[PDB]
Amino acid sequence: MKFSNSYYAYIENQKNDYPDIGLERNPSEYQTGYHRIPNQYWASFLTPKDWFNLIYNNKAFRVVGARCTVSNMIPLTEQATITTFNNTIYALCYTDNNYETEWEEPAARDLSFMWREGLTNGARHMLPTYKHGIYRTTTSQAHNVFYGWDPLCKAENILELRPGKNAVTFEWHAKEEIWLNTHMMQQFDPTHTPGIANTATVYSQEIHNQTHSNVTPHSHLNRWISQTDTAPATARHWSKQAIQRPGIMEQQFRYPIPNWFIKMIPLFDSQNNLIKTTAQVLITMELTVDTIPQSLAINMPIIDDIIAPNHTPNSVPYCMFRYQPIIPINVGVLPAPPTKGVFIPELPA
Amino acid sequence: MKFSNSYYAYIENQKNDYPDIGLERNPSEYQTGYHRIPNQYWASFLTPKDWFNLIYNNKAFRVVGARCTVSNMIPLTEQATITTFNNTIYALCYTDNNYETEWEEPAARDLSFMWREGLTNGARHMLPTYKHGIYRTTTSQAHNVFYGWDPLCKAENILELRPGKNAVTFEWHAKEEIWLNTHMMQQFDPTHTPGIANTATVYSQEIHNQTHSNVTPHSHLNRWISQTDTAPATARHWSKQAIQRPGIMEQQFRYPIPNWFIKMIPLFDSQNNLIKTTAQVLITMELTVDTIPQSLAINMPIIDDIIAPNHTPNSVPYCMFRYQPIIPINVGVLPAPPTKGVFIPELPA
Amino acid sequence: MKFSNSYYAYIENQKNDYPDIGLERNPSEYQTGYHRIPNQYWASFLTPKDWFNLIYNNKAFRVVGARCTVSNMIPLTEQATITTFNNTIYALCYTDNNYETEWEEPAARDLSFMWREGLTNGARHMLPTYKHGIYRTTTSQAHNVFYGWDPLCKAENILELRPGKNAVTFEWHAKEEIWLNTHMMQQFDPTHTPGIANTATVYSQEIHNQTHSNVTPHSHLNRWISQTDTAPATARHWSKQAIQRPGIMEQQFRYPIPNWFIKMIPLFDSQNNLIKTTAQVLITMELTVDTIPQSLAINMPIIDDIIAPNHTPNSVPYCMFRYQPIIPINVGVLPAPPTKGVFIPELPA
Amino acid sequence: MKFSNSYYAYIENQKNDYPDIGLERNPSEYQTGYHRIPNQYWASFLTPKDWFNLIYNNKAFRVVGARCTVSNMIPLTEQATITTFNNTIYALCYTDNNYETEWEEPAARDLSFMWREGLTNGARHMLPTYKHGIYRTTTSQAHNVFYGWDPLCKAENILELRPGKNAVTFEWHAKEEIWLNTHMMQQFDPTHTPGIANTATVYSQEIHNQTHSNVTPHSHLNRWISQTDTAPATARHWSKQAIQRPGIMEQQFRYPIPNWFIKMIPLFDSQNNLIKTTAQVLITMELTVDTIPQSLAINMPIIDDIIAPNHTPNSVPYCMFRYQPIIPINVGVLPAPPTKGVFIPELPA
């Protein structure tokens, strides 16, 4: 099936604070001023009804592609009194298919779909900016200042978004078929069981929450650390939960969704000061997911606990994304990221 | 190549003891009365000569498909005096390709091929019945009583076996190529060896026994537990051998052989009592295995220790299935399930 | 791209010291007298400029095939006075595509490309001979003496190299696409990071050296030991670094480069003594590697630390092969074998 | 099926020591200097794996043809210091299809297939020479000196083998279909039984050994002695085991494999002394055997006791060739030569 969700966001022309000239830092970090379209987690693509349509009555699903269309550019200027006029300026759209930029920082209650007018809970929905860091290896003596990432170095690949009835599209296609079960629990072999020998036990990834889980996990490195790092057993990373529990191999994408960058063109005046030009944009996040319909030999539908909208007075409401918790299917790969699961029945001593 | 083995077994019409109405149990288990055709292990498909033909003079093999034909239905009634007459009744044949039913419990000396007349060691060869369990996740509050598995809910997929010259076929096709070596031992890299550095050592899965080993291992969950469960190090399942040693990844099937269910139609009298109708059936278990012939540069054939028929006076005879123990081939995946292996030469301190 | 390197080496007709007739040894080892063409590591195929052309300006590469042509056979006899005459004799060329022979022992500064005249640092470049070992499993009682490897048992597959303008070619083709990044470092997920939560850290395989690293790693067994061996936790192999850190799964070849065997025909006189016939051969090692060009959005090229030629007075010079150490790409598989890596920034407590 | 085995042997140019001029002997014997290719027994054609492939899973077999290709002639001269040069000389190859030469003397552990390099257990594999004997009948007064066998008398049928890339082929085709069972034991008629009347007993040729048994027995004369010789009962030959037990009539070949003769050309110097020229030759012994596959109605394969490799410390290893010892088939001819058999059950008084 295919999900499409539109909302309004704001972008600016913050200048690229090019790599620091001062004292050298091994992870040399700087602000690029480029806004990053949120395209990593499920909540960045799906409303709760989209998630329910995805999980309900389907036994497996796989992500086929993602797409974002930025359109209806309405530029705004403030005389620091808010003029809605600009014609010549444009936005810079760049897709990092080189995967040389840092992954998106986790969003804290993005919830851009409950407030689609551009004012999320009484605050302007300004897109998050990207802060780039330059990491050289420890042994090398290269100066990081020379290796600053800049899409203008690949300006032949930069698309521009003019104001008005114009649209710039970001596109991603899955180059691998990663089918995920919609059920959070599977059976063990009676001969190869963690419970009572020659008896049936079930492991279940508990209900948890999938709004902030990556649509493309791509956590391959975590599994590789335990395979390639020859540090002694007293090393710090061996006790880290990320290294210990990397995530299912058949669940991570080799070519995940890249970072999508958009930015108003920065302009400077005679006093070497950036003149600020904000713009409203209609962001249409679209996700394509292939599904296999579910045909279980039962009378009931598996509908409860899939979504749980939580709201308390004066607190920001939110709805959790969850999988089917009722019946285990013993074929397919568990979909949820590494989280504390349970065993049914509980293991003995 | 292709293996076919026929034998006679018996089935009944035990009623489906639908989910318990009484006190709720998280693994709500009940008897479905459905007989399960043994189709999981090697001994369910292969006689010792079939196993020897499979392993001898082949360097690799892969399971292509499995098939079971149930025919020559001879129904019997007992006046609790054994009438061999029934014409209208029929059997219910259902294949669980949804993989929502528990895996087959291990067979204790099934040995249905040494006694093919229907009387295994002076006991009627009645097929094993399936006891279904309903596992919901711990957190959910769903009542398991409503989620009882029943093929009559998918009665459009139920095939029927009439008595007489009739046949119902169960079919399974491998959707993945899982090639397994016929040799139980391989070499290490001299640069990446567990023994003496820059020296040759060999790991060998010992002779063991493969009669009860799954033809399609499908033990994927065991490897996933160590990748997704974020329980603390003191958790019970971390010390379980099943979790610690899951089995070779390249050895497990993603779409293994499903459970095949057959059942006489249950009938009830005025006193609400099941009237018992037993039937003899000719079961023809068939397995297709692709093989690559072996062309080693040696003078001897690797024939010993492949099968070891054990018989002691007054004890039930049995023959063990084993792989080629003589020469290691350093390419391909070891075939045997996780079992205590040896190193040649033994590792130093 | 495609790399070709020619050099001169020497081969002899050392007789096959067939399996020992004396006291039995479980790893029964003997000298076969067959010379083994060095074809396992990068330095066996690539000069430093070839390695730099491979790594520089490429973001990924995969090994497509390897080839060795042995030609210009000039046989020599010594009257133990060095006659360069022989016409009827020939060499025996055999490829072990059965993978039943031990892997090549690590070469100690092979460096056959700096001295291509046949005299490496004032020593004749005689090809290394193969010592074959017969490993049976511990439990079996088979005599290893009967299972000696000998290509004359497959003499229908032996190619012969006549002296003069003649050539015998060894060929290997990769049957799997194993793409490797040219960068030694990748980013972590902020949500699934070993460092500060919701913050960016990088794992980096340090610079190390890749001259002696396998062009086809094929270290699958090491990862399988932790999946199939059910020995108790106090077993010797559980603390071995090879078992603990097997290497990246997506990095090992299922069908690596086999051993290539060449040997002068052995001849014996009336006193049952081998008459020694040495021959000079022109060895042309050729490797085909597919590459994807690198198009990073940076101004600098990543050129330093890729190769570091080390020379000290009166010590044999050597050049190290290394990957790109400057910029991490978060897609693809790390290329280097298991070696002590670093984290940027360093992990906290 | 078809068996091919290659190995290296040595031949010389020993002069034909033409019939003795001295005192006359009725069996006038002399050395012809012609090397005889071993082509009479099973071990001259089959490795143990070839024998196992022949006997296992086959109920009958017949010898179709035999072939020997002598090639890769490398001549050697010793200055009684071992020169590998000769171009003009050649070998003389002659096939005795007249069957006028003595049959091959039994080989004492020929075992040329375990050591195929030309040095069998630290001794040069020189081919056995043929010593011809001239037998006239007792009554006749012909001088045997005039009837010396010499292929130069039929030099139009002599093939020559030049050194280098040249090959001379010996060929034999069976002109009769002699099918032999692979089972060493058969049933008797209850009406015509040596045991209890109207009861079942089995005669079994015991396991014994078939490495030195003729591939073509051709022992017709032994059976004819008891049919044509009218000597009195006190004659010496009536108590000989060869006459008493000739061998199965349906087992002997009327046109067996003839003697194959090869010889370096003899050359003489001014002092009437033979100048010795030894040559290495690649002997490729090939045997074609038709087989009928075995389809017994049993579960086990008949694999044990077929071959028994015997090795003791410091003693030359050897493997015995044997037939199927488990199940008697009551049709076909027993394959083994006359040897002490057993009866099951044992005969009463």
Residue numbers in the entry:
A (entry chain A), B (entry chain A), C (entry chain A), D (entry chain A): 1 to 80, 88 to 356
Sentences from the paper on this structure:
Chapparvoviruses (ChPVs) comprise a divergent lineage of the Parvoviridae ssDNA virus family and evolved to infect vertebrate animals independently from the Parvovirinae subfamily. The SsChPV capsid exhibits T = 1 icosahedral symmetry and is assembled from 60 copies of a single VP.
The SsChPV capsid structure also displays the canonical eight-stranded jelly roll core and long linking loops that are typical of the Parvoviridae. All other PV capsid structures have a disordered N-terminus, but SsChPV is ordered from the first residue, which is the translation start site of the VP ORF. Compared to other PV capsids, SsChPV lacks N-terminal elements such as the βA strand; Met1 is part of the βΒ strand. The extensive gap at the SsChPV twofold axis is occupied by the bulky sidechains of aromatic and large hydrophobic residues, which create an expansive hydrophobic interface. The threefold symmetry axis in the SsChPV capsid creates an hourglass-shaped invagination; the pore present in homologous capsids is closed in this capsid only around Met256 and varies in diameter from 5 Å–13 Å above and below that site. The wall of this opening comprises three α-helices, donated by the GH4 subloop of each subunit.
